């Protein structure tokens, strides 16, 4: 399959409660492989996390000034970076982007050479990073180091990271009244998290009438999802649930009973 390495970093100020917390979590696909938390009680990687803590604190101080903000409030800087590769291990694309207080701030474009800034504050960052040739350093990491490490981790972890576990599926039925019942189509035990779960009525998608819960972790590496439709009593066999997942040898068509 295709694979991703991605870091999810959160820095959050907390005036009067010490310096901003920094947490960095790294993933290969839906599997966490590292965490660094500045609040938690190999040397070269730890050193880069510790320096990154300081860098994100610098960032938060600069951002407060770019938006004329008071020293009283808490603010959040998030970052996502890493690489996507195909089944052959070749680079598909790199990522390096930021959000401040939940709003997109700046992103490295797909070219790995230029920046997209959301506002006049992010333009300041953009000019600074252009002056310091930051993109060239990010590009070297994303094309070089990130792709090489992801290929090594995939090979070393091939029995889990390269194994797709199909969903275990069933349909449940619950009357809501004399006139209507819920049909719920379940997918349990799958990995990776990407899945398509849909209801059809007479072979027409029921997007508007389907309740689809967010895919959710089970805690054993696997994921769960369901999709429900309310159907008239007696009409259950007109409804089909369709399941697509990388671990299935073929897509599933399920009905009640």
């Amino acid at each position: 399959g295709s694979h991703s390495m991605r870091y999810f970093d959160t820095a959050m100020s907390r005036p009067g409660r010490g310096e901003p917390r920094f947490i960095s979590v790294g993933y290969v696909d839906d599997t966490q492989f590292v965490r660094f938390d500045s609040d938690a009680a190999w040397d070269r990687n730890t050193q880069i996390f510790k320096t990154n803590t300081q860098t994100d604190r610098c960032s938060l101080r600069n951002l407060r000034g770019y938006y004329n903000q008071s020293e009283a409030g808490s603010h959040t800087l998030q970052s996502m970076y890493g690489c996507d590769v195909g089944p052959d291990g070749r680079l598909l694309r790199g990522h390096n982007q930021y959000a401040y207080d939940g709003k997109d701030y700046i992103a490295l474009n797909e070219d790995l050479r230029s920046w997209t800034a959301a506002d006049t504050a992010a333009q300041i960052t953009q000019r600074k990073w252009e002056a310091a040739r930051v993109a060239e350093q990010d590009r070297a990491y994303l094309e070089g180091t990130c792709v090489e490490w992801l290929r090594r981790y995939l090979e070393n972890g091939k029995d889990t990271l390269e194994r797709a576990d199909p969903p275990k599926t069933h349909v449940t039925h619950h009357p809501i009244s004399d006139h209507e019942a819920t049909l719920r189509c379940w997918a349990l035990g799958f990995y990776p998290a990407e899945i398509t779960l849909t209801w059809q009525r007479d072979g027409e998608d029921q997007t508007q009438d389907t309740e689809l819960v967010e895919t959710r972790p089970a805690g054993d590496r696997t994921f769960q999802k369901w999709a429900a439709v309310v159907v008239p009593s007696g009409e259950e066999q007109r409804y089909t649930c369709h399941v697509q997942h990388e671990g299935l040898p073929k897509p599933l068509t399920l009905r009640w009973e």
Binding site: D9, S24, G26, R44, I48, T55, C58, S59, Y141, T145
Partner: peptide
């Protein structure tokens, strides 16, 4: 060699 990316201050 390192797997973590060096970050730059915004």
């Amino acid at each position: 060699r390192a797997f973590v990316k060096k970050k730059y201050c915004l």
